[PDB]
């Protein structure tokens, strides 16, 4: 049985932080569902790339559970994720079943909004640190990718490959991650 | 006046090699037109990400000239670019007006198909080297990004940021490229 991933795509998401993890997870043989927060319609990302989701979140959330729930960044995308009751329920359920939650850039601020994984070490984009740290509910890290148990976080577009390969390693193991990495021509 | 870029998007294109340059060029204030080879409809990329183009190539090609023409990779995407008479005309015109042509991964094999920039140093994805070198019309380089005059090439998904920043440097200068680079959190 293949592992499954839910990637939640909201208006204003950073398109690089969305596409790199989707592509790399699919290279690892993970069944990835790109789910539109607002519905089935294509989504306008932060730099105006328009991506058509595989499903609405409304539909996708009924087809769980998932081995990982992925939250892309982008300031406005993360704000939309943070305001969503559906996202809150999905993340609480994932936390309760001890499943992986992965968030990049401004994405981890949605964990704060929904009170997920308090007491974890986390990283974010440098510009999102103050928002994430409001109330002191996490301990901040400057690592490019941070993993504290089931909370996996990362910093920005330039850490997206490292973030995605960390998800692959967590789900399918180090060897699969190494095999997927090689053809990418990373430095 | 802002610089303009034409990104030609074909079925089977590598979505990371498409989105990273579009996003980074837009961060640099370049007016980027994502043009669908087959028309106006959304395009299914190599790893099944679906991207809606800004225009058909048929329309976009009448709105030139462009300061750069960008060819993403992906084996099947590059094959589609290589078979296109419209792409041939655009590239020949760009070469004739001494404008920049940028191609990544398998993308440079479309230069060979259309007889563009013979005698240049080029790079490609390692797996595309033999196709690119058929006939010995280029000199092969293992640099992560290669630039020989107006022909700019690169190797793969993991060199996409370097490729995009090289386009920005060529069009808008080193300082703009450095300013765009900093918030990306690259290593």
Curated annotation (Swiss-Prot), chains A, B:
Impact reported for residue 25 to I: In PARK7; does not affect protein stability and degradation; does not interfere with homodimerization; decreased detoxification activity on methylglyocal-adducted CoA
Recorded source organism is Homo sapiens
Membrane recorded as keyword: yes
Protein name, UniProt field: Parkinson disease protein 7
| Listed result of changing residue 125 to A | Strongly decreases enzymatic activity
In this chain, the site described as Cleavage is at 148-149
Per the UniProt entry, the effect of residue 103 to T is: In PARK7; loss of protection against metal cytotoxicity; decreased detoxification activity on methylglyocal-adducted CoA
Write down how the cofactor binds this protein: Deglycase activity does not require glutathione as a cofactor, however, glycated glutathione constitutes a PARK7 substrate.
Consequence when changing residue 165 to P? In PARK7; strongly decreases enzymatic activity; reduces protein stability and leads to increased degradation; ubiquitinated by PRKN leading to its recognition by HDAC6 and targeting to aggresome where is degraded; interferes with homodimerization; abolishes interaction with PIAS2; reduced localization in lipid rafts; almost abolished detoxification activity on methylglyocal-adducted CoA
According to the UniProt record, what happens if one changes residue 148 to A?
In PARK7; loss of protection against metal cytotoxicity; decreased detoxification activity on methylglyocal-adducted CoA
Where is this chain's protein located in or outside the cell? Cell membrane; Cytoplasm; Nucleus; Membrane raft
For this protein, the record's PANTHER family field holds: PARKINSON DISEASE PROTEIN 7 HOMOLOG, PROTEIN/NUCLEIC ACID DEGLYCASE DJ-1-RELATED
UniProt cross-references to SUPFAM superfamilies, sorted A to Z: Class I glutamine amidotransferase-like (SSF52317)
Per the record, what are the reactions this protein catalyses? N(omega)-(1-hydroxy-2-oxopropyl)-L-arginyl-[protein] + H2O = lactate + L-arginyl-[protein] + H(+); N(6)-(1-hydroxy-2-oxopropyl)-L-lysyl-[protein] + H2O = lactate + L-lysyl-[protein] + H(+); S-(1-hydroxy-2-oxopropyl)-L-cysteinyl-[protein] + H2O = lactate + L-cysteinyl-[protein] + H(+); N(omega)-(1-hydroxy-2-oxoethyl)-L-arginyl-[protein] + H2O = L-arginyl-[protein] + glycolate + H(+)
The entry lists its GO molecular-function terms as: cadherin binding; copper ion binding; cupric ion binding; cuprous ion binding; cytokine binding; DNA-binding transcription factor binding; enzyme activator activity; enzyme binding
